[PDB]
Amino acid sequence: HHMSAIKPDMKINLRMEGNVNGHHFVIDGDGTGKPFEGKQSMDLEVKEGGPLPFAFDILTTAF
């Protein structure tokens, strides 16, 4: 076991690239979280392929 360097308050950067039913998309993400409290939030922006022709919900567990 070692020091994780994980702070109680962390920032989150994210880029998602994907394809659903032939439809390509790029989604950028920026958020914050509390790892030891098990909580996070993120602001997501569709950069390419918007508006998405499918339910956004299917992507959410993958951010």
Partner 1 sequence: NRVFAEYPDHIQDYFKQSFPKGYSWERSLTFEDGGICIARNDITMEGDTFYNKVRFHGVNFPANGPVMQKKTLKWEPSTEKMYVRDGVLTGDITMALLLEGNAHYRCDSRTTYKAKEKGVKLPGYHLVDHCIEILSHDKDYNKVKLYEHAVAHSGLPDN
Contact 10, 35 (CB under 8 A): yes
Q: How far is the CB of 44 from partner 1 (least distance, A)?
A: 4
Q: How far is the CB of 20 from partner 1 (least distance, A)?
A: 4
Which pair of structure tokens corresponds to residue 36?
A: 């030891």
The amino acid at residue 6 is I
Contact 54, 20 (CB under 8 A): yes
Site for partner 1, rule CB under 8 A: 1-2, 4-7, 9-22, 29, 31, 33-46, 50-63
Q: How far is the CB of 22 from partner 1 (least distance, A)?
A: 6
